Each structure stands twice: as structure tokens, then as C-alpha cells.
Amino acid sequence: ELLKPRTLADLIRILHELFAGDEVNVEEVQAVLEAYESNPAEWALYAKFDQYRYTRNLVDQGNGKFNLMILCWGEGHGSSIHDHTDSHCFLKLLQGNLKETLFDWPDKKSNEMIKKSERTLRENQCAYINDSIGLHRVENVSHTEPAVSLHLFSPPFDTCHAFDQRTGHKNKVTMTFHSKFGIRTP
Ligand SMILES: [Fe+3]
């Protein structure tokens, strides 16, 4: 039974229930993420920014079956075009706006990766992607407002591929945590 999360802690508790089994009800998870009304005081601890690029801040390690983290995007910070390593990815805006650009998987042939579509993800909205849907880039295109997003990955993963927009060629990247549980982890 899906109830509105009252706080971030409540959301985390609910997520542990939703991931108690071996499969994932994407629509339910997305709905509960969307239903949590971002409260900055509840996640300030995790919102550790870097001047030069976006940061990944681990919030909860889940039950073995998911990673929950907060990404902090300075003005103009964005990601690579990337996949999600055969995992579910939920992305909920906690502050600001992010531009999500969707791309198809490239062919073997070297070619420009042409965007399929783009959209603006707004505060409190929750997006979803998986490799069956495609690839994406996520960007804070604002010149004046930092963005903060809450990402849930299931299963957890710490590597993915970045794709060269000019060719479709991919390279494996290991993701690093800027902090874990509020503690900076150099
Ligand atoms: Fe992503």
C-alpha cells in the first residue's frame, strides 16, 4: 500500500519495503518518489557541492537491492551521455531544474548521436530511465540556480559508459562518491 512519504526518512523506509522483493514496480516507486515533497532541511546534510562538476552523495545503501544518492549540480554542470548498467534509474528533482536529453543506443558505425528528445525536469518531478528505453544526458543549464536531484538505482552499480556524442563510441567510467551518509569521502 503506497502512502505519501512524510519526510525523506519516511521515504527511505518506504523504499526499503518496495525493494523487499526481487522485482521492481517502477510505477509505484516513481509515484512514491514524486509524492515526497522536497524539504531542503531534510537533505542539506547530503547536498555537498563542488565548484567544477556535479557530485554524487550517497544517502542510503538500501537492502542490497538499491542505491539512493543525491546529486548536486552547480550552474552549468552536466553529465555525460550515459547508460545505467542494466539497472533501473529514478531521478527526482529536489531543487531547481534539469534538462534531460534522450539518445538511442548507437549503431556499430561511427556517427553523430542525434538527440531523440529533451525535456525539462522540474522541482519534485520524478523521471525514470533504463537501458531498454535508451541513454540520457542530464544537465543543469541554469546560470543562476544550483540543482539537486535524488537518484535511486536498482540494482546498485558503480560503473557505466559515457558516450561520445560525435561518434557513439563508449568508454567505461567508474563513478565515485563525493560523500557517504553526510561524510565527505575524498
Ligand atoms: Fe542517468
Ligand 1 center to 39 CA (angstroms): 23
Of 95, 71, 51, 50, nearest to 153 (Cα)? 71
CATH value at residue 95? 2.60.120.10
Maximum distance among all Cα pairs of the chain, rounded to whole angstroms: 49
Cα–Cα distance for residue pair 133/49, rounded to 1 Å: 30
Ligand 1 center to 184 CA (angstroms): 22
The reply to whether 84 sits in an annotated binding site is: yes
* Cα–Cα distances in angstroms (integers) from residue 124 to residues 35, 80, 117, 149, 151, in the given order: 8, 23, 21, 9, 12
Are the C-beta atoms of residues 111 and 166 closer than 8 Å to each other? no
The reply to whether 82 sits in an annotated binding site is: yes
* Domain residue limits at 29: 1-186
Ligand 1 center to 17 CA (angstroms): 24
Domains in the chain: how many in total? 1
Are the C-beta atoms of residues 103 and 81 closer than 8 Å to each other? yes
Ligand 1 center to 83 CA (angstroms): 6
Ligand 1 center to 84 CA (angstroms): 6
Cα–Cα distance for residue pair 128/113, rounded to 1 Å: 21
* Cα–Cα distances in angstroms (integers) from residue 161 to residues 6, 107, 121, in the given order: 35, 15, 23
Ligand 1 center to 29 CA (angstroms): 17
